[PDB]
Coordinates of C-alpha atoms and ligand atoms in Angstrom, one line a residue:
Chain A
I474 CA 2.9 -32.9 -35.7
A475 CA 6.1 -31.1 -34.6
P476 CA 7.8 -30.1 -31.4
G477 CA 6.4 -27.0 -29.7
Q478 CA 3.0 -27.2 -31.3
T479 CA -0.1 -26.3 -29.2
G480 CA -3.0 -26.7 -31.6
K481 CA -6.2 -28.5 -30.6
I482 CA -5.6 -31.2 -33.2
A483 CA -2.1 -31.7 -31.6
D484 CA -3.6 -32.8 -28.3
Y485 CA -7.4 -32.2 -28.2
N486 CA -8.5 -33.9 -31.5
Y487 CA -5.7 -36.4 -31.6
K488 CA -3.1 -36.7 -28.8
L489 CA 0.5 -36.7 -30.1
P490 CA 3.4 -35.6 -27.9
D491 CA 5.8 -33.2 -29.5
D492 CA 8.8 -34.5 -27.6
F493 CA 9.2 -37.6 -29.8
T494 CA 12.7 -38.1 -31.2
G495 CA 11.9 -41.2 -33.2
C496 CA 9.8 -41.3 -36.4
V497 CA 6.1 -40.7 -36.9
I498 CA 4.7 -41.0 -40.4
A499 CA 1.6 -38.9 -41.0
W500 CA 1.4 -38.2 -44.7
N501 CA -1.4 -36.4 -46.7
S502 CA -2.3 -37.8 -50.1
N503 CA -5.7 -39.1 -51.2
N504 CA -4.5 -41.3 -54.1
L505 CA -5.9 -44.7 -53.1
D506 CA -8.9 -43.4 -51.1
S507 CA -10.4 -41.1 -53.8
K508 CA -13.8 -41.7 -52.0
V509 CA -16.3 -39.3 -53.6
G510 CA -19.4 -41.0 -52.2
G511 CA -19.5 -39.4 -48.8
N512 CA -16.3 -40.6 -47.1
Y513 CA -17.6 -39.7 -43.6
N514 CA -16.5 -43.0 -42.0
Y515 CA -13.4 -41.3 -40.6
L516 CA -14.5 -39.3 -37.6
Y517 CA -13.0 -36.0 -36.4
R518 CA -13.5 -35.8 -32.6
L519 CA -13.7 -32.0 -32.5
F520 CA -15.5 -31.9 -29.1
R521 CA -12.6 -32.2 -26.6
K522 CA -12.7 -31.0 -23.0
Chain B
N1411 CA -5.6 -4.5 -18.3
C1412 CA -7.4 -7.1 -20.4
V1413 CA -8.4 -10.8 -19.9
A1414 CA -5.7 -11.8 -22.4
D1415 CA -7.6 -15.0 -23.4
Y1416 CA -4.7 -16.8 -25.1
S1417 CA -7.0 -19.0 -27.2
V1418 CA -5.6 -18.0 -30.7
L1419 CA -2.5 -19.0 -32.8
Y1420 CA -2.9 -22.7 -31.8
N1421 CA -6.5 -22.0 -33.0
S1422 CA -7.5 -21.7 -36.7
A1423 CA -4.3 -22.4 -38.8
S1424 CA -1.6 -20.8 -40.9
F1425 CA -0.2 -17.9 -38.7
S1426 CA 3.5 -17.8 -37.8
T1427 CA 6.0 -19.0 -35.2
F1428 CA 7.0 -17.2 -32.0
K1429 CA 10.7 -17.8 -31.2
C1430 CA 10.4 -15.1 -28.5
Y1431 CA 9.1 -16.8 -25.4
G1432 CA 10.3 -18.4 -22.1
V1433 CA 9.4 -22.0 -20.9
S1434 CA 6.2 -24.1 -20.8
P1435 CA 4.2 -22.5 -23.7
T1436 CA 0.6 -23.7 -23.8
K1437 CA -1.8 -20.7 -23.7
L1438 CA 1.1 -18.7 -22.1
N1439 CA -1.0 -17.4 -19.1
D1440 CA 1.0 -17.5 -15.8
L1441 CA 3.2 -14.5 -16.7
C1442 CA 0.9 -11.9 -18.2
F1443 CA 3.6 -9.5 -19.6
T1444 CA 3.3 -5.7 -19.4
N1445 CA 2.3 -4.2 -22.8
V1446 CA 0.6 -5.3 -26.1
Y1447 CA 2.1 -3.4 -29.0
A1448 CA -0.6 -4.4 -31.6
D1449 CA 0.7 -3.6 -35.1
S1450 CA -1.5 -4.1 -38.1
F1451 CA -0.8 -4.0 -41.9
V1452 CA -1.0 -6.0 -45.1
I1453 CA 2.0 -7.6 -46.9
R1454 CA 2.4 -9.3 -50.2
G1455 CA 2.1 -12.6 -48.3
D1456 CA 4.8 -14.5 -50.2
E1457 CA 7.6 -13.0 -48.1
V1458 CA 6.4 -14.0 -44.6
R1459 CA 9.9 -14.6 -43.4
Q1460 CA 10.9 -11.0 -44.2
Ligands
LIG1072 C1 -10.7 -15.3 -40.3 C2 -12.1 -14.9 -40.2 O1 -12.7 -14.5 -41.1 N1 -12.7 -15.1 -38.9 C3 -12.0 -15.6 -37.7 C4 -12.4 -17.0 -37.5 O2 -12.0 -17.8 -38.6 C5 -11.7 -17.6 -36.2 O3 -12.2 -18.8 -35.9 C6 -12.1 -16.7 -35.0 C7 -11.4 -17.1 -33.7 O4 -10.3 -16.2 -33.5 O5 -11.7 -15.4 -35.3 C8 -12.4 -14.8 -36.5

């Protein structure tokens, strides 16, 4: 999630243009979730064409 | 004289930046350069920026 990135997750998995000059909040902290009982509800979408 | 196959860097993770290219990055392609001076070695890993 930064300008100039070309990773698959950048556009293939999840589309997010790198030219944004505003504010995008994508943090990474389990904290509240703490789901140890198979937290597979959140899909990945790896297969992109 | 190779297929190039610019399917790395954006692949996997970690790696380093480029700062040494032209315009429209993507899988580079288009311009296919002239040489590939492939240098290999192992560093401490903490420096990186050195
Ligand atoms: C680092 C390692 O042990 N094996 C890598 C693999 O992780 C990577 O997906 C593949 C694509 O270039 O190249 C090899």
